Each structure stands twice: as structure tokens, then as C-alpha cells.
Design a protein around this ligand. Structure first.
Ligand SMILES: [K+]
Ligand SMILES: [K+]
Ligand SMILES: [Mg+2]
Ligand SMILES: [Mg+2]
Ligand SMILES: [Mg+2]
Ligand SMILES: [Mg+2]
Ligand SMILES: [Mg+2]
Ligand SMILES: [Mg+2]
Ligand SMILES: [Mg+2]
Ligand SMILES: [Mg+2]
Ligand SMILES: [Mg+2]
Ligand SMILES: [Mg+2]
Ligand SMILES: [Mg+2]
Ligand SMILES: [Mg+2]
Ligand SMILES: [Mg+2]
Ligand SMILES: [Mg+2]
Ligand SMILES: [Mg+2]
Ligand SMILES: [Mg+2]
Ligand SMILES: [Mg+2]
Ligand SMILES: [Mg+2]
Ligand SMILES: [Mg+2]
Ligand SMILES: [Mg+2]
Ligand SMILES: [Mg+2]
Ligand SMILES: [Mg+2]
Ligand SMILES: [Mg+2]
Ligand SMILES: [Mg+2]
Ligand SMILES: [Mg+2]
Ligand SMILES: [Mg+2]
Ligand SMILES: [Mg+2]
Ligand SMILES: [Mg+2]
Ligand SMILES: [Mg+2]
Ligand SMILES: [Mg+2]
Ligand SMILES: [Mg+2]
Ligand SMILES: [Mg+2]
Ligand SMILES: [Mg+2]
Ligand SMILES: [Mg+2]
Ligand SMILES: [Mg+2]
Ligand SMILES: [Mg+2]
Ligand SMILES: [Mg+2]
Ligand SMILES: [Mg+2]
Ligand SMILES: [Mg+2]
Ligand SMILES: [Mg+2]
Ligand SMILES: [Mg+2]
Ligand SMILES: [Mg+2]
Ligand SMILES: [Mg+2]
Ligand SMILES: [Mg+2]
Ligand SMILES: [Mg+2]
Ligand SMILES: [Mg+2]
Ligand SMILES: [Mg+2]
Ligand code: NA
Ligand code: NA
Ligand code: NA
Ligand code: NA
Ligand code: NA
Lengths: 51, 88, 255
RNA sequence: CAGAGGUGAAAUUCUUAGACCGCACCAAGACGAACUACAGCGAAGGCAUUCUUCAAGGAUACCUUCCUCAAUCAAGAACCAA
RNA sequence: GUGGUAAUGCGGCCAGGUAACAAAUCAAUCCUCCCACGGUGAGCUUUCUUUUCACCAUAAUCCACCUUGGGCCUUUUUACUCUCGCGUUGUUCGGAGCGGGGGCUCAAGAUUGAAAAAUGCAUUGUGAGUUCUGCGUUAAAGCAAAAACCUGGGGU
RNA sequence: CUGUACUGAACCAACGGGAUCCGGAGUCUUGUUUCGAGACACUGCCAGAUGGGGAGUUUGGCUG
RNA sequence: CGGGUAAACGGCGGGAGUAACUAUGACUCUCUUAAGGUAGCCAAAUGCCUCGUCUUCCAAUUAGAGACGCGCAUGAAUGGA
RNA sequence: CCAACUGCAGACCGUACUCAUCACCGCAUCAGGUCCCCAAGCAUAGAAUGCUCUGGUACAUAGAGAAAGGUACACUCAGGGAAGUCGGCAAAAUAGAUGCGUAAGUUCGCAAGAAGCAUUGGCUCUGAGGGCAAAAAUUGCCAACUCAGAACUGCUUACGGCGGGGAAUCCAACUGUAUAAUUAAAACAUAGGUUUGU
RNA sequence: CACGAGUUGUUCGGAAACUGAGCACAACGUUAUAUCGUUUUGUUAGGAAAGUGAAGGAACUGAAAAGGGGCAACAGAGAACCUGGGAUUAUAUUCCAAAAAGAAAUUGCAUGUGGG
RNA sequence: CGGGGAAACCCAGGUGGAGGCCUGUAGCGAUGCUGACGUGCAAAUCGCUCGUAUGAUUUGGGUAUCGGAGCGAAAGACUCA
């Protein structure tokens, strides 16, 4: 949660992504911090391709 | 994952009081711990405190009704009867 | 022999009401002049539970009729009474749940509770959770109202007796199995010292007519006369009948 | 006021502590006769007093809309007299 | 009496409030223990040992005023348009007003100083315990009261 | 008999007349505080039945 | 006197014949009660006879278990299973 | 007028000591009983248990000292393994943690730690699990322990503490209660069921 | 065992001064007999149980206010003090003497300064 | 929260901490040894073993109910050996 908060404050992810990852973090989707970061990077890569 | 097959909230009792007493108790147990619709304020926020005492989290109304549900059907029938009789 | 338990309880002693946390007697308003000739308007300030009682109680605030002061009434709350509700009591009060009217002003077929057996009783009939009376008919000549009590008996009272419109709150309580001796313990904690119950045949013949024997048995019929003295009047007291009731359950009580 | 009931005939049963029968009522619970039909409605099971009320369903009418959205079935689901 | 759009700031009688209340969870105040560093004393020293042990303290009561959490005000309020957003470890919450910006307020602590070194004995950072406090489920069980005190509503 | 058909405030009247009373706030009392019963059902005495609830007492003798 | 009532106290039968060999007895006659022990269960913590009979358990079982029921004297909120 | 000083005055009773293997009750300085607060270090899950700094103590009649026979909060025992006994009484046995695995029956909750199988030392390392600051997916500094996996190297299987297990029958549903001082049970209670009076 | 000592408080505990489960004086009733009963479900008693804020010309008079007087907690409520001492043979948040080692808080009365 | 599902719903993994739930301290009891002792440490104790240990739990103080009586989850238990 502290990671997601910091990422939202620095504008690395938007509100929709923050909310989704927040509910998935509460649901035991990410095993550690690096797992969450890699998922964030994957989201950002797909977003760049779409853009 | 679903944690019990049939015993829902009654799983706190283990194997200890008979299936039928557990089941009849369970209907009312589930009713008395559920959130009930508040006709004032339009939310599902009525919770029973003590037997018959129902308090809404939303509008902070307290309502007397029902040992285990918010309104007994006898109450609804009586209310409709009283409305019809007053309108007579 | 020694004193039977049922006769020991009459001494009071350790068998009296556990009333320390009780809020006080629940009553209608005093049948004063304002209620006899007009109506009094009240506000439900709180719905509260009290130890030993299934039904909910309502604290209703009225203005004093003769002084600058507030009067707080403690009533047995009908189902549906909510905080902030206006309660009208009196001769001219409208027909609505929670309002208190004389029985002659209440239409036949109406469901009522907190019913005065005598005018000014402040309520003695249909007060347990879920209970109510049904108004059967009025006799405008004799000024008496006939009603059906929760027991099934029909009783007539003066039409000046007041009733609350509705049914007593807290209904449905006896439908949930208790399941545990501890739950019975907590249920009777707020009432009186009457539990657990020891069967008379499990006692010794010194303290109970059913006591003794080399088997547990009542050695004589358990139906006893209405004229039995205390200490002998145990078992099935002046029973008209015994055994499993087949077909229609007859209304209990006197004729 | 001396019987009533019931049967092929009886008896069990009720009855001068008044039964049966008679008139007007009272209460409670069922049921909705005749009209009632090779008639109507409903997927089936089913459904008959009146009035007030809720959502529906079908047919018909159409120079309305639309454009293949259908037919029928393991699995699964809902209803179902006594 | 008086200021602020406001939250709110400052100089007989009647009705509320404090007193005043079961549990768990998670953070925790002091305090206890440990570790790091640095002083002071002691111990061991055949041989090793930048070592081992002890100590390094700050009461009540006051003044001023850098966080955590709760309540609230004002302002933006196309905030929730078809995957709404915020937030807890945790059972949530929002047009009956979420979130953002800027404020008001309460409760716990910080920090500054007065006390206070004139006293005491021969030091300034972390990690674990710890319920003061903060966060305002069993129940057919819903978990005292009063004095005293506080504030208002009316009136002088 | 001034109000009605999901939380307000209301007290120590003003006001109007007569010389402080008066009314505002009606007056009256073969009188019961009010309501419901009612001369019965409640008090005492007398009488009958019932009455292990309880008290007192008894439950022979001879006897391979 | 006359009704009611057993989740009141309680109660809940025998002897005398019968089926192509033997049996035992669906059947029948009878004496009889307030009713004649139903569903179940059993040598059961309830069975005298009794260490009952059969099976199983052991090298050997007055023990244990599973059966059987002529049940001295099982059995339904005196609650049965 | 009364809100900051200032002046004077602040009465009564309790207060030693003890609170227990010697201060109370039990005839007594009695291995019994008696409410509350503060509560350290290491091992460890730990207020278990073992040892220890501070505080406390060496007070319980002692000395000498291998008779038999005892008692023990003391052990061991070849071969057999319940043949002992009314009866496995007593004793032995099992044991922590982790992974795997787990039958009949069942009120679907359990039965279950069913049953069973395996592994755990010591050393030297490797990996994973964070916080703060200025494709920040990087740049420095730093703290707390855990879990996993290797190589090497040992065992005399080695402190404490710590279930034996299975197949059935009778009874009671269960947790409770109960003959202080011979009976703890199948007895009582219980939820549930029924009846009676009103 | 003998002799001689030792317990220091505005603030600590109690009481002055709260209510609880309860108790039972008065009152009334009962009893041949009070040495009995009722006595908190807001509350005694057929029951007239209030004795004084004010004023008005220094203590004398008197409105309104319903339900007598007490007791029951040394763990509930309540309650203004806390460190240092080279200060004892033994007491200490109780003792310490003008540099009270000292630092406070809090009552009750009085005195001044000032007020708007 | 992930996966299936036309729908009703189903299959996972995490979170959370319910229970007159279990192992086990203190506490509260007292099963067995038919151990110790049995002119005792003791007019009921000691050791090991054992039941329970969030509840119908344990406990201080206060308070209420007694001898033809009280109280009793009932043993004729207890009411100062
Ligand atoms: K020796
Ligand atoms: K040895
Ligand atoms: Mg009482
Ligand atoms: Mg007995
Ligand atoms: Mg008897
Ligand atoms: Mg008997
Ligand atoms: Mg029996
Ligand atoms: Mg019996
Ligand atoms: Mg005839
Ligand atoms: Mg007639
Ligand atoms: Mg007839
Ligand atoms: Mg018709
Ligand atoms: Mg049917
Ligand atoms: Mg006798
Ligand atoms: Mg003789
Ligand atoms: Mg038979
Ligand atoms: Mg048999
Ligand atoms: Mg046998
Ligand atoms: Mg046998
Ligand atoms: Mg057998
Ligand atoms: Mg029967
Ligand atoms: Mg002392
Ligand atoms: Mg002590
Ligand atoms: Mg330890
Ligand atoms: Mg220990
Ligand atoms: Mg000693
Ligand atoms: Mg000795
Ligand atoms: Mg051997
Ligand atoms: Mg060997
Ligand atoms: Mg043998
Ligand atoms: Mg032998
Ligand atoms: Mg053994
Ligand atoms: Mg299985
Ligand atoms: Mg098993
Ligand atoms: Mg295992
Ligand atoms: Mg049992
Ligand atoms: Mg039993
Ligand atoms: Mg059973
Ligand atoms: Mg238990
Ligand atoms: Mg038990
Ligand atoms: Mg005994
Ligand atoms: Mg029993
Ligand atoms: Mg002496
Ligand atoms: Mg009292
Ligand atoms: Mg007192
Ligand atoms: Mg004090
Ligand atoms: Mg338990
Ligand atoms: Mg012995
Ligand atoms: Mg006996
Ligand atoms: Na008898
Ligand atoms: Na009258
Ligand atoms: Na008798
Ligand atoms: Na001792
Ligand atoms: Na274990």
C-alpha cells in the first residue's frame, strides 16, 4: 500500500490503475514488492503500445 | 473458497447440538446479524443491537421491531389494517 | 418432611426479582384531564432494552400539563416505534401505531396492545413481546368493549379503558432454540433464581411428595385436587385432562 | 313434549337433566350450488361470489420499428395434483 | 462584551453534559530489556581478550508552541460513467456530500524554556516487551447510581 | 370544547376596568379525590365435608 | 349417579386340534379381559433354568462379539429403537 | 462591583512491625489454609522447565557409617515378552518441529495428531523477504531478523520439556454438577419434547 | 526475658460529604406480649412531618418548593504535593527553617492595585 | 480476489479470528497408585499421576435466606472438625 501510494503521488500510475492494484493487493495477488513493480511495468508497457 | 458446505455461521458449534436445532437456529442467527433496509434514509444499514432493538448506521434511527428480523409479518398486516381503518 | 421448594419460594428470600439494572415499570401515561378531554403529544426519545424483558421499551417525552417541566414516560414499545416519532395519547388522538386511545374510540377489528383492564390501569394486558388484543365489538349502551386476549379468552372492559395501537415489539423470540445450558443461565440471570430445575422424583421423600423409591417414579397419580394444601399441591394441579392433546387445543384458564 | 337417529332389517348412539323438530340469531372453519356447456384462461400441475387493487399473458388491428436476432436438445436451471 | 463567510476565536426556574462503565484487534506513553556509539570506574591479564562488568539521572507544577489520529467548515463539487473513487491487518464509506485545495477544532504526544544544578551518581540513537492512551464479537447476556461539578435556555 | 389526523419554544401573565381589588382564568355545591363494582362479595362467629401438608401414637404372644 | 381424561398412577391372557415323510402350524374351535404387549429390542447394566444353542475370536474361551428367541420377569416421554 | 496579587489561618483520627516453611487460623515457631501490587538475563512457543546478576538464605538436631528389611518427586538388567494378575495394576512405551500421507463412520462440523513414512547436528556459503533521502526500472546510506537451498564435516542418536496406537460392545448425547473426610458414575443438570393451572 | 525508647501530614487513607445490594429510627398497623410487620417498582405515615432566599420599617417577619430522619464501599464515585536530603537506633510524598534543600497546588476569610 | 458459468450458481487462494472447541501454565479440582503416612507434617496431609483451564469460569469485600428451619445442577449434600 505504501508503494502504491507513492506511485500515485508521483503520477507513475493513474487513479484507475491505483484502484485496481489496490484491490488486487488486498486480494493476495502480489507476493512481494518486486512482483507488484513488475506487474506495474507490464501495465505501463501495454499502455505505451496502445498509445 | 467456501469454507463449509452447509453450516454457515453455525460452524462455531462444531458437532455439538444436533443438526435440526442448529438449522432452525441458523435461519434466525443469519437474520439477526444481517443488514436490514432502512425506510428512512434508504440504506441497508439497520443492525439489531439487543433483542428487538434495531439501529441504523446511516441515519442513527433506533426502531423497535422483531426479535430476529427488523419487521415481523404480523406487523406489516397490522400496519396495513390500521391504515385502512384510519382511512375508513 | 421438610418444606417443599415451591413453598419455600413464597418466603421471598433468594428467589426475588433481579431488578437492579431494570429501568423501572413500563406504563402508559396517567389518565389525566388532558387525555380524558383532548390529547397529549409526545416524542419518542429512545428505544431501549431492559434485562429480563423480551419487548423493547420507549422513553417518550411529554410536556407537563400544569408546570413548566418535562415528563418522561417509560412504555412498552409497539413494533415500529422509532426515535423522533410523535405519539398522541388521548380522547381525540388519531388512529395510528403507537397512539393511545380509549377503547370506545377504536374501530372493531383493530389490533391493540398495552390494554387497560380498568380505566387508569396504565396498561396490564398484552405486553409481552409479540402479543396483542383484538377488539371484537362495542356496546354503546353499557359502554363496554369486548376483546380477544392473547390467551384466546374473550374479555369485556369499560370503553373508557385506553389501548395502544399495534402489537408489542420483539416478537418471534421463542422460535430460536436456546441450544445450551449457558444460554438458559444468561436468560434467567436478569429475571430471578429459578433455574436449573430438579425433578421431584430425583429428590428424596423428605422434601418432595415424588421423592424416594428404588426406581425413580411417582407412586401415586400426579393429578392433585384444587383443595390440596401447600406442600401437597405439586404435580398436575386440578387437571381437567392429561396426556397428549389430540385435535383442537381447548382455551386454557377458567370459564 | 316422547321419542329421535340409523338399516336390507337392526344394533352401536342421542333423549323428560327436554333429544329430534320449529323461528330469529351468534361464533368458528371450509366451500362458492343452480347458471355450468364436447364453454373460457393457464407451460403443465391447475383456475368459478362481489368490489378495490398489483404486475403480467394471448389474440386482433397497423403503409409503426428492426433485420435473421431462429428451430430443437446432453449439461445446468425453474415450476409441478394428491 | 466582542471577531471570523463558516468550522469557531478572543477578553427563582428549566434543559442538557461530566462523573459513567462488557470484549477483541492493531498502533502503542511512561517504563523494562537489548544493541550501536562515546565517556567514567572496576575486573581478568601464564597466554589471549580495541575485552568483561557497573554507571552515565532530571519530580510535581508552569510558559510558549511539529507530528499522529478523530470531528467539523468553506471551496471545487460532470464525485458514480458502465471497470466510480477513498481508506483499514480487520468486518468499510460517500449527492443524507467521496476525493483534492485551504482552514476550524478536540485528543494524545513532540519541541522551547522556567523549575535545574544550587540537585543526584562515580548519553544520544535504534530493535523487542509493555494496555496509559488511540482507533469513539456471545447476547432470549446489551453490560450501576448519586453527590459534586460544567454549560446553556429564559430572566435581572 | 383555541392544537393534530422521522426530535423547537412555551414558567414567575400582559392587557382591560374599579378604587389595591376585579376579569383575563365563567359560576354553583342536598358536600362524596376520581374511576369500577356494590349491599353482594369483605369482617367475625357457628356448622359440615375434605385434608400424610402436618402432629402424636401404635403396629400382640408362643416359637429347638 | 352420570360423562371426560393414560406425555395421571398404572396395566397390556391361557388350552386343543390341524398342511401328500417328520416337524411347526398360516388355519379352526374354545375359555376368557378394561385391554390382552403393537413397532422395535434381547441370555441386553433386564433370562431362573444357564457356563442356554449356533458362529467367530484362542492350542485351549463360565470372558468378548455376531446370530437365534419357548422373553422366570424386554417394550414404547414409568419413554422404545 | 471583583480578577490577578498580597496577609493570616489550614481542625480530627490512622501511621511502629508483621502479613507468614516463625508475627493470621489450624491447642504449636504445624510440609494444611489465607485477597492485592511491582517481577530481571540465557535457552525456548513460553509466567512450561533448567541454570544465572540484583535482593534474600545456608533456618529446619547433628556425627560416624555399604547389615537384613523398608521408603523414594532413583536407576539398570541376558533370553523370552502378559506365560504374572480378578484385571497390563505398576512400569515400560509415544514424544518437539517440518514435509508428505491419513480408513470405517458422520448430525458434513468432524473422525484427525486417525493410522503411517521421512527429515532435523556443526561449519562455510548462496538466495529471497525492507526503510529513508536526491527505464528514479537509479544513486547513495542503513536497520531487524526469518525462511529456503548448496558444499563440507560429525554422531556414542546423547540436557530439559514433550500424545502410545488400533478393532469393537454397554451406558450417558455433548460442556457442566456432585456424597469437605472410603462412591465422580450409567447419578443430577442441560438444550429439546409434553402436560397442568391461570 | 529485663530496662529504656520509637509511629510527626492543609494535600497520603478515613471522616467531615456520594450513591449500591441492603438495613430499619420515626409513623402507622398488628400482637395477651414489640423483642413483629411495612419501610426505593420515586420513596414513610388517613398523611397538616418544608421554619427559611426575599423584602420592609440589625435580627424580627414571610412567598414557591409534593413524597420524614439516618445508616451501609479503607478495592465503586470522590480526593489540592513531589522531588532532594550527610534525615533516625527505630518514622517519613508526615521530619528539614530564611538561601525553609526547596519547588508547587488548594480552601476560608481579609487588605491593597486596577477596572469600564 | 482468481477461474468457470446462458443463468442459478460452482471451483480455487488469501483475509479475519468464532467456539459452554482442543494441547497446555497460573488458578480451580481430585482419577489412579487401592503409593507415602496411617500414636502422621496433617482429627484427610504428602508425591507422582490425573480433570478442567473464555466459562453454567475462578476469586476479595459487602449484602440477603436458618433449626419442627434454611439452602441444594439432588449426594439426605451443606448450615464454623
Ligand atoms: K555408601
Ligand atoms: K544405578
Ligand atoms: Mg423486589
Ligand atoms: Mg438420590
Ligand atoms: Mg412425603
Ligand atoms: Mg417416588
Ligand atoms: Mg427414569
Ligand atoms: Mg420415571
Ligand atoms: Mg327412528
Ligand atoms: Mg330445550
Ligand atoms: Mg342436533
Ligand atoms: Mg356462484
Ligand atoms: Mg398438500
Ligand atoms: Mg406421621
Ligand atoms: Mg416374640
Ligand atoms: Mg412381541
Ligand atoms: Mg432375552
Ligand atoms: Mg449380561
Ligand atoms: Mg458371551
Ligand atoms: Mg450378545
Ligand atoms: Mg404410552
Ligand atoms: Mg511503616
Ligand atoms: Mg505479602
Ligand atoms: Mg520461565
Ligand atoms: Mg515456573
Ligand atoms: Mg526452619
Ligand atoms: Mg525436622
Ligand atoms: Mg530383560
Ligand atoms: Mg536386550
Ligand atoms: Mg493369564
Ligand atoms: Mg496363572
Ligand atoms: Mg498405568
Ligand atoms: Mg471417510
Ligand atoms: Mg476412531
Ligand atoms: Mg504423526
Ligand atoms: Mg455425561
Ligand atoms: Mg444424566
Ligand atoms: Mg445416549
Ligand atoms: Mg470444558
Ligand atoms: Mg466432563
Ligand atoms: Mg467422599
Ligand atoms: Mg439427569
Ligand atoms: Mg517480651
Ligand atoms: Mg437502597
Ligand atoms: Mg455512608
Ligand atoms: Mg486524602
Ligand atoms: Mg474448553
Ligand atoms: Mg493407599
Ligand atoms: Mg439415598
Ligand atoms: Na404424597
Ligand atoms: Na363513586
Ligand atoms: Na394428612
Ligand atoms: Na506453615
Ligand atoms: Na503439541
Amino acid at each position: 500500500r505504501r508503494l502504491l501510494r507513492k506511485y500515485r503521488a508521483d503520477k507513475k500510475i493513474d487513479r484507475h490503475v491505483y484502484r485496481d492494484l489496490y484491490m488486487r493487493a488486498k486480494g493476495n495477488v502480489f507476493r512481494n514488492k518486486r512482483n507488484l513493480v513488475e506487474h506495474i511495468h507490464k501495465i505501463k508497457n501495454e499502455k505505451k503500445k496502445e498509445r | 473458497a467456501k469454507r463449509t458446505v452447509k453450516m454457515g455461521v453455525m460452524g462455531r458449534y462444531g458437532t455439538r447440538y444436533g443438526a435440526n436445532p442448529r438449522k432452525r437456529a441458523k435461519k434466525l442467527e443469519v437474520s439477526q446479524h444481517a443488514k436490514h433496509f432502512c425506510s428512512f434514509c434508504g440504506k441497508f444499514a439497520f443492525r439489531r443491537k439487543a433483542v428487538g432493538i434495531w439501529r441504523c448506521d446511516g441515519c442513527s434511527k433506533t426502531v423497535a421491531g422483531g426479535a430476529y428480523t427488523l419487521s415481523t409479518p404480523n406487523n406489516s398486516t397490522v400496519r396495513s389494517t390500521v391504515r385502512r381503518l384510519r382511512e375508513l | 418432611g421438610k418444606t417443599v421448594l415451591s413453598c419455600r419460594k413464597g418466603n421471598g428470600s433468594v428467589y426475588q426479582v433481579h431488578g437492579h439494572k431494570r429501568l423501572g415499570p413500563a406504563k402508559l401515561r396517567i389518565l389525566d384531564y388532558a387525555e380524558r378531554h383532548g390529547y397529549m403529544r409526545g416524542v419518542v426519545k429512545s428505544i431501549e432494552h431492559e434485562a429480563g424483558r423480551g419487548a423493547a421499551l420507549a422513553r417518550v417525552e411529554f410536556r407537563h400539563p400544569y408546570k413548566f417541566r418535562r415528563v418522561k414516560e417509560l412504555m412498552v414499545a409497539p413494533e415500529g416505534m422509532f426515535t423522533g416519532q410523535s405519539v398522541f395519547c388521548g380522547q381525540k388522538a388519531p388512529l395510528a401505531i403507537g397512539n393511545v386511545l380509549p377503547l370506545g374510540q377504536i374501530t372493531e377489528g383493530c389490533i391493540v396492545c398495552n390494554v387497560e383492564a380498568k380505566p387508569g390501569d396504565r396498561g396490564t394486558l398484552a405486553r409481552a413481546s409479540g402479543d396483542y388484543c383484538i377488539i371484537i365489538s362495542h356496546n354503546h349502551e353499557t359502554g363496554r368493549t369486548r376483546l380477544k386476549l392473547p390467551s384466546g379468552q374473550k374479555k369485556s372492559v369499560p370503553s373508557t379503558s385506553r389501548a395502544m395501537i399495534g402489537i408489542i415489539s420483539g416478537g418471534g423470540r421463542i422460535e430460536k432454540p436456546v441450544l445450551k445450558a449457558g444460554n438458559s443461565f444468561y436468560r434467567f440471570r436478569g429475571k430471578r433464581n429459578c433455574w436449573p430445575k430438579v425433578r421431584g422424583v430425583a429428590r428424596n421423600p423428605v422434601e418432595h411428595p415424588h421423592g424416594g423409591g428404588n426406581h425413580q417414579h411417582i407412586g401415586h397419580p400426579s393429578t392433585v385436587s384444587r383443595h390440596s394444601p401447600p406442600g401437597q399441591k405439586v404435580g398436575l394441579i386440578a387437571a381437567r385432562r392429561t396426556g397428549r392433546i389430540r385435535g383442537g387445543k381447548a382455551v386454557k384458564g377458567a370459564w
